[PDB]
Symmetry: D2
Subunit: 322 residues, 4 copies
């Protein structure tokens, strides 16, 4: 009755909160983490994930370093950002837990090779992606049978009404924008069930959630984990608040959906989709057949109140996830 997880992540503010949720939730069993380039470099992602494990008073979970670049490494696709800090998590390396030089090293084996090996042996595990899809796509390029290895794939990324969240010249969502080829490969060639948490799920209900949930309340308990997550989210919170809104949950929702999909996904729809690669403004956009597409489940509305309750349980140490 535990859910076995492998989480692939670019290790910035929301990623580390999402990973903390998974490390504290009693239903979750984390087999490994895999780091991918994204909002920060892959080395920094690796370091942030390892630092987060320590913050959660855990050990002996392997973190594998993966792709440094997108498949093509085209400059127009680049999504590296200092929005959350240069280090992705508040730029305070001396605060608990203090950054160590070994944090920037992985277990040894490339993430893509680790994904193959781990999921071959653990066919009942869920793979959750909360960065660009590069590691998963490289696994497929190496081993077409990997298409069947995960029990389920839960992706934070993409869209279904072409609502982009990178900039005004693209209709792509951030993680897809960061490696459009990889997203194309994964959506077309995976054979397990896929659940996508699209950008629209966040976009359309953001003003409503901002009125009804205090997204900072779980940070205030004064536990080590609360204090670490306060630091990690600090620069994101200040910048959002300067624009009159709260820094709200994103990647956390994908990890929560992995843990209990029926609880967190209030509404969902199955759609037949593919990814545009060649358009000037639409590269990285999901294209839906509303009239080589694959049927995928989209979460169209999520239970933000349950995710919030779980984060309070995680940071307070209450253990109250029911």
């Amino acid at each position: 009755d535990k859910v076995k997880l492998v989480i692939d992540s670019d290790g910035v503010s929301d990623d580390v909160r999402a990973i903390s949720l998974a490390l504290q939730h009693p239903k979750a069993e984390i087999l490994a983490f895999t780091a991918v380039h994204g909002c920060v470099t892959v080395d920094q992602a690796c370091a942030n994930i390892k630092r987060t494990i320590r913050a959660n008073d855990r050990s002996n979970i392997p973190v594998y370093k993966g792709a440094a670049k997108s498949i093509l490494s085209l400059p127009k696709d680049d999504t590296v950002s200092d929005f959350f800090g240069i280090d992705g998590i508040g730029d305070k390396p001396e605060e608990f837990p203090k950054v160590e030089r070994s944090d920037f090293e992985g277990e040894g084996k490339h993430a893509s090779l680790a994904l193959i090996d781990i999921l071959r042996e653990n066919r009942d595990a869920t793979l959750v992606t909360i960065g660009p899809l590069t590691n998963v796509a490289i696994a497929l390029q190496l081993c077409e049978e990997f298409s069947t290895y995960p029990s389920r794939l839960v992706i934070m990324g993409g869209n279904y009404y072409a609502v982009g969240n990178v900039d005004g010249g693209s209709s792509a969502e951030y993680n897809f924008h960061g490696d459009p080829e990889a997203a194309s490969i994964v959506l077309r060639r995976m054979k397990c069930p896929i659940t996508i948490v699209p950008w629209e799920a966040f976009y359309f209900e953001s003003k409503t959630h901002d009125a009804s949930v205090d997204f900072s309340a779980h940070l205030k308990y004064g536990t080590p984990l609360a204090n670490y997550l306060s630091l990690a989210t600090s620069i994101g919170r200040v910048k959002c608040e300067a624009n009159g809104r709260q820094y709200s949950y994103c990647d956390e929702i994908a990890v929560a959906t992995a843990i209990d999909e029926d609880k967190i996904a209030k509404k969902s729809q199955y759609l037949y989709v593919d990814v545009e690669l060649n358009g000037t403004k639409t590269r990285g956009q999901v294209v839906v057949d509303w009239t080589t597409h694959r049927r995928v489940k989209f979460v169209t509305s999520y239970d933000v109140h349950t995710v919030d309750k779980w984060l309070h349980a995680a940071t307070s140490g209450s253990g109250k996830f029911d």
Copy 2:
């Protein structure tokens, strides 16, 4: 207090019903019609419009023939269809009003030149487009000042959530698909207010409208106009009914919106948009900046009950448009 209209159309089943609505509505003053290629050839469009004027017991309204092809005339863009009949309006040329050989000829002047001349002199007129945008785009190529000539442009076409209605390999809406370049030119380079009636307005409420409106009731009065519109829509109605739904209004909504926008457009949104030209699956799709775009008004929900009331008034001869 009359609204002066120029209507540009490809002259198939819904076009001819829309044009009939405009010819019967006491608030509308029709300056001219312009024919464009689309679901049928431009010659057939011209013929269908002229036949429709006669069916409405009107005369002395000029019909100008326009573009035979899209700007590029690429085969992948082609939207010619026999869905409504070979002639676009039920394939019964001998029924009232009988087709005449002169129906396939226009006034003489190319439509695009007529659009320039008429709207230069009638700066208070609304231009309504219910086919591909080729004629309007050619006018702009000839005369950049045309960008200011219409008082308002009401377009039946496009989309705002990338919901396509042509086929499963495109996210474009039909009229945009038929000439993507023209749609790009018009949206970028017109300077008057633009109101677009997008495909989503029809798509999302179709099952609801199908339950609550009888779209065939206005056809049953036994007047000449009812009988003509019965013929014109006959093949569309049989094919829709064979798939368990009614043939519902489409182009009629754009003409109605031109006549009284505040009445017909129940909800609307302004968005900053451009048109994708280069994508494999997204050519012709509208791209929205949700984060060279132009601000346009989209009608997101329309009052189908008022349009239905107006069509009953038109076909019955009641004159009851209030």
Copy 3:
């Protein structure tokens, strides 16, 4: 006599090409049509009208056409001050002095003029030495126009994907300026088409530079020689600063229209199309080499004959042969 209509963006080499046509006794010019290109369409019009005066001619209509490319995408833009802000040396007070009326055309849009003129003169050759926008608009208005010229001679395009705009593109300049127009014209014209591609200039550039003095025809001190000296002045100075002569370009397309058998020494006939969607290859000609109507590409031209004709034009010697 060969009847010509010349569609041009009216910069330095255009003006010299048009002068060649005005002086050559085999040519009969029906009309000029101005198109945007290296300068605005208004400036092109003005330059063409000024050039007609410098050649001691009158009563040839100049029609103003497209101000913009079909799409008017900013990445296609080819406006340049390389030959001067006015495209011909920036000395509006020198003979013939620029007049305000130079910036106006005959009245009707060039594209409508091309339809009318060529409908009535089906034995005429259309020569294009700017972007193809006017010709493409004509086709959009009138598909029958596809058959009206007896021949179309195009300065533009390429056949080995050698670009001359910048390192971001494999397109030639005139095609880069309106890729959609080039696509329409090459697919939809039905008359014989002769293209003078960029490679014809590129490959023999250094050989020509060694064997021909491209300035000598300017030395005669006639009014036309002094006008062409002015028109080409900024180009010549900029080329010489980089170790090269300012050499003929558009002149070759006009010469080819006057006597194709003499000027086109070697030719290839190819099936072609124009790429529109590529990131680096938008505007490039794409050739089917693994074997619609074949198009004739001039692969080598007789620069010495063109030079001899330009000497005759500027000197007034009549020696065209």
Copy 4:
């Protein structure tokens, strides 16, 4: 000795190229890596292993790589039965007879093998004679791999946009088979790159066909001559039916790797990239002609030396010179 690793799709000309490398006394083969291409990767592997036996060699590892192109888009597909369903004449019972174990590789994926082998042998040349998928996967796993080979010799691409797949494309065959891979390799490898483009074959096709008997080296009646006769049989019959000899292709890239100064008679150094997004130009090399590391293109090769080497290989004469 020149140390080689050869990455191949294992069809008729590949097998002859590999035989050249196995017989030439200057070559030392570290390993072969199989890639999808004209046949499946499994068949490529099998063909390479069979070829090693036909050459009286043993104990050279063959690693199986990518089954598909990076994207696996159906429009890129280049699988063909032109040389037979098995790519080498469809006679599995002839010497050396096909074994079931031929379809298996050494174990580790070719891309991982390329990293390992070339990390330890930084003086080796990598030669690619199929699509570039394996090399691109290696780079995705290990950006340092960019510096591992001492040189990369690629059979593929073009420099004047002359395609050899069909009229819908300006791409060369190996590049058409995985455009993304070609883009990655040409942008991200940092070692010297020599490309043997399609134009080197195309332009001199008819001259070579007149001066070289491309079948004569098959006539010796040695086991290798009989095996290469079989391997090339269906190609030869299909070319002869169309009035042409089946001429060398991949063999030239392998020969160039063995002695680049001898085989590459003329070369050009160009800055290049690969178009991915064009409708007709996807996979085409785009060259910057208006002047990252320049790449060397072999524009003319010494077919007579390659022919002499193939005679020595099949005859057993030792006469490589």
